[PDB]
Amino acid sequence: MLKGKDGVVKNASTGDSIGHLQSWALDTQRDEVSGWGMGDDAERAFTTVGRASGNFEVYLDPADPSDDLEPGDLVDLELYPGGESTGSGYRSVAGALILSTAESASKDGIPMLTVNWRTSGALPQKATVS
Amino acid sequence: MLKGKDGVVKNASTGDSIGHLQSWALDTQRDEVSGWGMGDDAERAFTTVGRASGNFEVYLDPADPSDDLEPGDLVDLELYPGGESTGSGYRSVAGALILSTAESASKDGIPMLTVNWRTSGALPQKATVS
Amino acid sequence: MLKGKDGVVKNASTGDSIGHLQSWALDTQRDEVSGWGMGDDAERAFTTVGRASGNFEVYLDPADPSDDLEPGDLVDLELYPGGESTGSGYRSVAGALILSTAESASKDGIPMLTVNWRTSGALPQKATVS
Amino acid sequence: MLKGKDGVVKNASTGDSIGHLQSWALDTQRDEVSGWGMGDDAERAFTTVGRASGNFEVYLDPADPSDDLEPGDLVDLELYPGGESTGSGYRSVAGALILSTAESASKDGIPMLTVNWRTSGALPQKATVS
Amino acid sequence: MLKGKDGVVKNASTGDSIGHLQSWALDTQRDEVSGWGMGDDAERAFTTVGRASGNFEVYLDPADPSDDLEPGDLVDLELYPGGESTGSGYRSVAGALILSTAESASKDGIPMLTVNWRTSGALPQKATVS
Amino acid sequence: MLKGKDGVVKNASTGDSIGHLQSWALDTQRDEVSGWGMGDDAERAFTTVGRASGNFEVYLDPADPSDDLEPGDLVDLELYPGGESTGSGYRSVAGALILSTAESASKDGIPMLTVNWRTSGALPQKATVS
Amino acid sequence: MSEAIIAAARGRLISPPFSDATGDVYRTPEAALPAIIVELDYTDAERISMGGGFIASAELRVEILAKRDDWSLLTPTPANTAEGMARLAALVRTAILAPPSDLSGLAWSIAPAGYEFETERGETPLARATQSFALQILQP
Amino acid sequence: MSEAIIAAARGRLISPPFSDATGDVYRTPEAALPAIIVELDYTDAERISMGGGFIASAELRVEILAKRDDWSLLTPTPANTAEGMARLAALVRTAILAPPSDLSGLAWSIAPAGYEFETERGETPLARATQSFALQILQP
Amino acid sequence: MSEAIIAAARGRLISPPFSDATGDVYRTPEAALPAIIVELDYTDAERISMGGGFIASAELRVEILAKRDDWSLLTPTPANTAEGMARLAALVRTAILAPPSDLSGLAWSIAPAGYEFETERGETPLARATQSFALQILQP
Amino acid sequence: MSEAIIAAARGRLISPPFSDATGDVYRTPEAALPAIIVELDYTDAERISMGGGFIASAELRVEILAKRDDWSLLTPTPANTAEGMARLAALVRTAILAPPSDLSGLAWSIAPAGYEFETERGETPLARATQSFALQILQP
Amino acid sequence: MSEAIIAAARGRLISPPFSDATGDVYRTPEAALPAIIVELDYTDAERISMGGGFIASAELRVEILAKRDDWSLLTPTPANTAEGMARLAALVRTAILAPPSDLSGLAWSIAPAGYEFETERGETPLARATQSFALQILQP
Amino acid sequence: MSEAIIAAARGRLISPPFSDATGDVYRTPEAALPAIIVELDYTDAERISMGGGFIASAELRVEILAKRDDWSLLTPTPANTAEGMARLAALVRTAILAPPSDLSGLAWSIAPAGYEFETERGETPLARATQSFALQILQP
């Protein structure tokens, strides 16, 4: 039961935490192929290839690297669900490609940026921090 | 009227309960073929092949086997809706294939993982525990 | 204005009430064919063939026949909207084919099963109980 | 501003009000064809053919003609939005074809029936009652 | 900041305000064509043709011209967002074609009519009232 | 953490702030192409071309340039998320094409206009104000 | 229009054979054992249409005070407060919630918002009954 | 119809061997140690169908006052207020929430809205028990 | 701007032929039998636009105190509190909720939030009437 | 079934070495310095299934009154009200919220609804602790 | 940071020519006829970001007590409580809700939560005015 | 675990140079002019996981009573209640809401639920400050 208020996402290449973040997400998926024949009760299935994606939301920032990331950029992202405390697992994705960014605001609220990423050529690797 | 707060899902092969779980689900479906002819009031139908799927949600865990399951893995899952008390029915699925896993968090909440599975080559078998 | 807390659904063949039920539903539909010509203000229509479907929800049961029904089974269902009191109408469907079943639970709730059925070769027949 | 609690829908052919009704609806539609050419600022349009449809909901009834209507039946429906008081407009649809009927109930509620109709060969005609 | 409780929509041809209205809406759209080539960073775009549409809702009326409008009719509509007070802008649409009308009611509510219109051959023209 | 109640959007060409605005939004996207081969665990991806879009909402205005913008117009828009105070970043989009405008009102509310724009031939450029 | 609705009520509730006095502070009599009083109470409100209209949410409260044989018109045990109060109330409910249109029209909905029986210890026993009826009236 | 429902209650609660008096202000006796009183209370309401009908949300409150051996019918320690009150209440609950249709029909739902045990210090100890039952009754 | 709205009210309610005094604590007279007082009360608030604006939710309360022939202008039985209070109130409602734009404009919505008639036992009978009108005013 | 649940509680809370008295109005002793009392309180309710069932929302309140060395079993400073009350309460919480099924079964959920420590100034200081436990019990 | 916001208020409200005293219990003077007092009141709160931040919902209450010519600066009839209170209040509102950034920044939103005029009967008439301003301040 | 959290608080609030007494009814001293008291208060609760866990919603209230130079540590005008209370409170807030993990961990969220300054008229002026901190603690 990680606390979830201490999560840190950092760009591995430039070594900077992203900024005041509202939320993070990650997903991993593998496609399915099903086949059945005449006279068969159940359908057999197998998994072929894998992709991963995710998104993070942060208050709009002109004083942090939050500002720098751009659609099309290739970045290395290390995400710490429970923080960087020793023995806390980190999900590291290499070659993350940033597909899209979205900025929004309202009269009564703080401006927000949402970044969506996909993985290219690699799959997220779990590891445990020192 | 099972209580539903005592449900245990265990990986049969390694004999470990999955972890602090929020919710479980299972479904079984059989496809339909309908045919009618010129001059007929109703349409006749028959069921051809069957598939099963399900999903479970658990708080994110670095100290339990919750951590280990991966998309594409083949696992044997035994699910106890009412617990392992003697005489409680268990749904056992063999050859469960894990299609997808999803991790998410928010500033005010605990991190969560959702695992989705399908069955390959087998159908869930009901049985009663000793 | 039937009360609706007394509704009983029974499997006609084995003569057993299904169990602690939350809700029932039934539907009857007939498809439409419309045709209009050049120079015509309105479009004429006719009804060709008919199908019926329905679903019922019950708390999960290991001590009742609720447990027995399976996808693909063919069953005879008699549904009493207002109960079995004399003079209460019953909807009887013959050759009901059970397409799908779904089991679910949550930490704070009782486990539930939802059964979906279609009719094959027959149409529901209204009748009045003795 | 008709009151709307006095609306009566009656089957014209058998002269019976339908029953304890919850709600009624009617719609009229005419399809559109648009064409524009190279070099033109706006697109011209015209209306070709017309259809009408509607639905009504009533508590389930074994003592009224509410019970009798069936999918596929052809009926004449006269609907009084503001009641039958003299000088109140009535929408009369001839040759209404009843495509579908749906019965439902829950543990805490009264059973309900919803009937959906289309028009065949005719368009609803407004008229004022004597 | 027009008040919005004083809006009047009038049929220009017969010079009558529509009636007790709940709400009005208008929209104007122009389609987009995008093209990019091999080796180009951004995609260029242009706007080709324009259409306009809108809808208004009013309590059902047997004593006003609200009653008269019919699907398929061609009408001239002048809409005053802020009323007819001198110097208040009016949106005038010529050749408005009324595609559809919908009447509805419930046990606890007043009957309502919704009219949907499109423009044929013309585009709404803004103007300022004397 | 910009305040978000001070955001100003101005048309660069005519130098006028748009008006009493409720909300603004911007988005930037780059499409993805994925390819995998027989025998490969993950799917590689790349980003090809980029587009940007956005929308803003303002109370309806007859005394401001809010009134002037029209679908199909090409405009230069400079958007200040945090205001025009020195050192505040501004997003400037050149060649913004206004695809659509929508006016709406209700009995209890102020009339509102929503403008949607796309970019043609250019991509939004971040810059810092003097 | 309270006066008109009250007037309808005045006609509608004058039928029991005893005077109805509304809002008389000084008056608190025991001589008029069977007692009736009708109050239009309060009206909350919301807009109607675009271009003008108003509607109100309104409550009408009817109160009955009684002793002895007034309770005992026909059936036995109307001394029991509940039976007696109900006996007068249901008919009263039908009086106000009657079929005639004029009474119904300015009132629109005439639903019973609430009901009550109350007990005050006088030599002759006096019991209070309340019959709130909710009427939504278009503001003129 | 309060009188009818109260009448059903009157029949349904007259069975304990002691008189039931409802709404008697002057009466406050200690001689009738085992005490029962049933109140129909209030009815809120909403429309039914189009063209006419009304339904009500209603509360029925049952109150029991007792001392000594009335508590001690069979099991030990009914002097303890909780056990004693529960002992009388559950059976009372079954009485009112009984299977017979007439009792159930005018009542529709018969759910226990609330329960309570209360303590008043008399030489003989007196304890009050409340058993609210919510019945939704169609307005006639 | 309370003063301006109050000023509009001051002009709008000065028409009944009697003085209107607002917030005079020391004063509690019976000589001014027909009595009128208008209160702007409270303003809650929310933001307008981006870049600046504010709007308020505000309540205006109008109270009338009266005795004798003031009630009896024309129709019979205005001594009855309800008729009398309604008789003065409806016209008052029209006064404040009048068509003139200036009165309406700073006020925006002018809906009747509430209505009441009250009874105080003086030799001459005095009755209090409240006419809350809800006005939403843009904060300047 | 309050008696049974109370009985389970009676067994479950009789373990501290002092008598537990529930609902004794006349009794208000200081001689029984360590004090325990368990109350089943109220049950609200809703329907179960179609064809029959009922469930209740219920609250169980446990109250402890104490002075002196009863607080000082082991750790220092239990005179401090908070530590002392917590010290008795947590174990009490485990007693009632224990693993045994019978205790858990009729109770279903056993969540702590509330907690409190209170101070009354007696020569020997007396402090009150409340441990509401919410149990949902199927109506028999 | 209450002190800083209060300090801003202290500077912002010291301008009327009379002393402002906040939270002086012993002091209740009539010599300082024009009276001003500013209170930071309470702060409720919620989390900011992931990794750290807090924000608060806060209310600032401004109260004015006055008599005689203090009301009568320029326009006639400020003796009328409403006009007088409004006259002082609107300017006060502008003082606190002023354009300067420092005052606005720690305050974020500065909306008028509420307004009131009150009447106390002293030889010289004293009237109380409240101007709640809601400021959301990031917790440092 | 109230005792542990209270113990953390006990360590965390013992630093101001004066004794902290919690829940001492008999004690109401003026000799200990600077005064501190910490209360764990109440815990509401909900289930965790399937198969077992519980979490609580809990409130911690910190109260400070003070006079004279205790207010005047450094900056001028801490006699003003608001400045003085804020001056002590913010540091106290940081004490409890400190970075150390143990203090934070059993507490989870440590948000300031509320703040207040109060005035009681003693020769030496005494002022009360409340600093509610909401901590959600997993039930052991």
Numbering used by the authors:
A (entry chain g), B (entry chain f), C (entry chain j), D (entry chain e), E (entry chain i), F (entry chain h): 1 to 130
G (entry chain n), H (entry chain o), I (entry chain m), J (entry chain k), K (entry chain l), L (entry chain p): 1 to 140
How do the authors describe this structure?
We recently characterized a novel roseophage, vB_DshS-R4C (R4C), that could infect the Dinoroseobacter shibae DFL12T, a ubiquitous group of Gram-negative α-proteobacteria of the Roseobacter clade. Here, we report the atomic capsid and in-situ structures of the tail machine of the marine siphophage, vB_DshS-R4C (R4C), which infects Roseobacter. The R4C virion, comprising 12 distinct structural protein components, has a unique five-fold vertex of the icosahedral capsid that allows genome delivery. In this study, we use cryo-electron microscopy (cryo-EM) and structure prediction to determine the atomic structure of the phage R4C capsid and the in-situ structure of the tail machinery to characterize the distinguished long rigid tail.
The adaptor docks to the stopper hexameric ring, with the latter formed by stopper proteins (vBDshSR4C_009) that maintain DNA inside the capsid. The stopper protein, a crucial module for head assembly, shares common structural features (anti-parallel β-strands barrel) with other siphophages, myophages and phage-like entities. The R4C stopper protein, with its long N-terminal extension, folds part of the N-terminus as an α-helix and plays a critical role in connecting the adaptor. Intriguingly, the R4C inter-stopper contact area (~274 Å2) formed by the N-termini, short loop, insertion loop and β2, seems too small for complex formation: we speculate that, similar to other tailed phages, the stopper proteins may exist as monomers in solution and form the stopper hexamer when incorporated into the head. After head assembly, the R4C stopper engages its long loop to fit inside a groove formed by the terminator, joining the head to the preassembled tail. As we described, the R4C terminator operates as a docking platform for the preassembled head and tail. Despite low sequence similarity, the R4C terminator protein shares a common structural topology with that of other long-tailed phages (e.g., λ phage gpU11, SPP1 gp1771), and integrates elements of a multi-stranded β-sheet barrel and two main helices at the periphery. The central α-helices and β3 cling to the neighbouring terminator surface, which is composed of an N-terminal helix, an insertion domain, and a segment of β1. The interaction between the R4C terminator and the tail tube relies chiefly on the tips of the terminator long β-hairpins binding to the minor groove, which is formed by adjacent tail tube subunits. Residue M50 in the β-hairpin tip inserts deeply into the hydrophobic cavity at the interaction interface to further stabilize layer coupling.
